[PDB]
Amino acid sequence: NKCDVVVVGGGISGMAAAKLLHDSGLNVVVLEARDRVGGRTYTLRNQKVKYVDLGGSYVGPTQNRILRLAKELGLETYKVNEVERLIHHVKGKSYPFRGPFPPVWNPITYLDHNNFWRTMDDMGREIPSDAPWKAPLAEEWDNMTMKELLDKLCWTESAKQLATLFVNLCVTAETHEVSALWFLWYVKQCGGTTRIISTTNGGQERKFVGGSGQVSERIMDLLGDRVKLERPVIYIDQTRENVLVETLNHEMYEAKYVISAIPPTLGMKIHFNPPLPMMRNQMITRVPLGSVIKCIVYYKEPFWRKKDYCGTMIIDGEEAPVAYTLDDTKPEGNYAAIMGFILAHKARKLARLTKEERLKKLCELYAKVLGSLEALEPVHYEEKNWCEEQYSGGCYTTYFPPGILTQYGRVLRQPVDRIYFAGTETATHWSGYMEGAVEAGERAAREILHAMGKIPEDEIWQSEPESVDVPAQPITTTFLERHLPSVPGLLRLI
Amino acid sequence: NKCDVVVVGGGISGMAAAKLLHDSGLNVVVLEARDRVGGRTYTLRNQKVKYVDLGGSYVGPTQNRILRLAKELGLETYKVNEVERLIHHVKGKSYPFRGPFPPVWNPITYLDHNNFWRTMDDMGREIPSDAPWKAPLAEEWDNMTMKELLDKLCWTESAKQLATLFVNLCVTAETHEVSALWFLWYVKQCGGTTRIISTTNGGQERKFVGGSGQVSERIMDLLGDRVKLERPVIYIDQTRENVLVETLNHEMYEAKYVISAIPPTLGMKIHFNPPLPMMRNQMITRVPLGSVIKCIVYYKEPFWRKKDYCGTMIIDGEEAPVAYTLDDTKPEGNYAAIMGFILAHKARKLARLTKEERLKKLCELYAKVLGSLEALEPVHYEEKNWCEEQYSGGCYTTYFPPGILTQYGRVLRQPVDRIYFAGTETATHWSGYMEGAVEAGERAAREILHAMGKIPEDEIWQSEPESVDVPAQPITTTFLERHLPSVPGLLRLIGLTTI
């Protein structure tokens, strides 16, 4: 029944919000639709895998909030294996390489690739993290898709194909599905192209020992019976003195404030009284989540290491079910595994297959790319198709189709009377990630503390000290990378 | 509690479905979220206006299902005024014209305009009405916005600007918001560019005497207490022998089958057990409705007629709040009024204003376009911003952003166990319209009749006899319209003569 704040959703964002409010002495209730916490994180345990992250997994430098929260809850990280060579598989052939970026040898192609990434970061510098619609060319960039931008910028097919893979991997969506403004914001707010795409010194550097699901689980442990599982919220009524929140299983909660910690579009599953303001009413129909199947194939040994491959594969082309992999072997060297993503349209295309059929396709692909018959001998397989989840809508996160961010972006985290908005989609740094979930949950909690007159306005948004365990190395460029001409630039010199 | 079929939604589609099922002898219940039926149709009555359609209003030739349904319910139509000259207002000046379309005099610009509409219809012919994802270039066309297509096809700004207005008006969305495949399908499934855009011989030919809301109201009258108002559906459970449908006001309905007669995305307001299959689960997050404020300014007299203007204004330019108007005067010649739409981004931009502020902007615009100080003297004003409606999501209808129709379109009307899908969005002819609502509601009802073994499979989709009251003239082209070159075609010809 009665409390200070009802938090809708027990993912990392809702849990982080509820923990902050609880720690500040307020009575909080978390209403969670599923029979588990964690949301877009989910750690499965069984004897064959020990544990495996089937949802969000990776953390890395500059993600100081999730690192701090997890540390406080008693979690540790380990490094994703990147000791040996990465592979870029293109036109049916594997090209091993060292460093974060696949080498390009044709000189014109080199200029084209160099210019593309440079231009993405250059454009990002004009986009405010907290207000992408305030970019000088916001409308121009929002009114084109990433496909149109790539078509404009890439003078080579090589660059266009790799840029396409990059978009598909970062946002689990096709280049033609997403706004260029939104995508450029998305990369910039993760620290740029190098930071978002890198394992060492980037977003994929580390995983949590025992799984990321432990973040939400351990906060649920702290909160005890304040977390109500299998309580999908169906109705929020703000017409009276206290806010009334009703669940599907016919319970009523009464609170001073509510935090909505669910993906924006999942606000549609709640009937509002009074109705939402027009802009939010339409916004929540305009913001889908991406499409992905996360697939983990287990082997007797991390056999790829013997061939001086780390397990990272960047696989171009329509035929390959999986465009990107990482080594998912445990820090101890056992439960050898390759994690791969079936991205965007391929998640839709291949969802029809059986689990065994997807396993066979992945093993055959890996055998080709790793040049090893050992890939054909899996000992176990786990997968999760996030497209099927009623209470997620997809993964990793919400994307904005052309025209939406400039028209509706302003209302994403605008309070609606006594409802405040958390969820990783409302973050300004690593929005889309567990890091963003923490930022947004804690910010939304502090908005309520401010509304209650408990903290001053300047304490709503709080900086985070850098992790001592996961220090960030700066991203650097060389003189040549900065100054080499684009393809049209070299043509203009002729 | 118990019935044969629960229909979710009491708009025209749900009402048409319920009526067909009721007439066939089944026990139906309609669960309607609002305190009224009609949905995206809404006829306001007061003394100042008598009646006015604030939602869907127009019907026309080839929309034979809505015409037949409305006729059976005792309704009559009248013709929208198009006697006098139309106006095209471009770059701050009005150019009156007759016949359907603004004349283009510049031979280059004329070639460009001619080619644009022709190409739209040419492309449409490649798109199956019942399966647009089967078009030979479906992926190519679905992966670009209408903005990209216009940028490719229009060699003049004049054609691009008019094409933009056309898209904004047809689908209450910006050219950069919508898939080219979906928009080309949308126009084709209305009979093409001429049919969709025309008043005389087109979609906007007529209105119902007394308002379109009467369609849903009169079916409610027939169904009696089978229509349950203020019953928003929150939960559908298909795990047991009979389907269970729960409403927000804590009632449970049990049925053999369900028809979902709501906009596809509003399916999100329902919690499903078991969960929807993956494709539908994601589809219903990918399909927004457009944005529009329908505004009606009333005057003492239809003064524009005295200046030989019918009241139709096609108004280009960012500054104009309204891009399109029609005379909304009653057939008797009283309650003189101009209907205008505030479209797409402008509905968002101008929603912040007060009603009085929007009225002032509209009157000042109309005074300019009509060259008439009388437009500054309104006697009354009504408006409805459909973007604010929890149980519509927008108007007129659902649009598909780039990439969606090819990836998810197949599941739009695919049954989910014992849930069948109605709603105008699932129609194959005039989807988006009252006509499409009738087609889809009746088709969904007949899918259930087939499931019950009451009718054979070939009776699910049923042709409609042409209206005797609203005959359709064929859409024709001239030899020159067919064969005149595009601008690049002309340039190719010039280059060949030069070489």
Ligand SMILES: *Cc1cc2c(cc1C)nc1c(=O)[nH]c(=O)nc-1n2C[C@H](O)[C@H](O)[C@H](O)COP(=O)(O)OP(=O)(O)OC[C@H]1O[C@@H](n2cnc3c(N)ncnc32)[C@H](O)[C@@H]1O
């Ligand atoms: C799915 C996915 C995500 C992902 C990823 C790979 C996959 C396959 N890779 C990641 C990575 O390696 N590193 C990283 O930081 N994140 C990556 N992600 C994304 C990450 O998982 C998400 O950004 C993060 O988990 C989102 O957290 P947030 O708390 O903002 O949102 P949520 O997890 O979706 O939680 C929402 C909760 O709300 C419940 N819910 C939904 N509707 C209701 C209603 N109506 N009532 C009550 N509860 C509701 C959901 O069940 C969920 O628990």
Ligand SMILES: *Cc1cc2c(cc1C)nc1c(=O)[nH]c(=O)nc-1n2C[C@H](O)[C@H](O)[C@H](O)COP(=O)(O)OP(=O)(O)OC[C@H]1O[C@@H](n2cnc3c(N)ncnc32)[C@H](O)[C@@H]1O
């Ligand atoms: C809004 C609009 C529409 C419109 C138009 C101008 C405007 C401003 N111009 C039109 C025109 O002149 N000619 C024409 O034929 N149509 C034009 N339209 C479009 C037209 O209004 C629609 O195509 C048609 O009315 C759609 O009918 P349909 O029956 O398919 O859908 P609906 O009217 O939206 O009805 C849905 C009903 O379902 C109820 N609902 C919604 N959610 C729930 C839940 N969860 N539970 C129970 N009921 C629910 C809605 O309240 C609604 O009544």
Ligand SMILES: O=C1Nc2ccccc2C1=O
């Ligand atoms: O899980 C992941 N999320 C990502 C986002 C960008 C690049 C790689 C990855 C992953 O491996």
Ligand SMILES: O=C1Nc2ccccc2C1=O
């Ligand atoms: O109401 C309307 N719907 C339309 C669709 C296309 C063109 C004109 C109109 C109207 O006037």
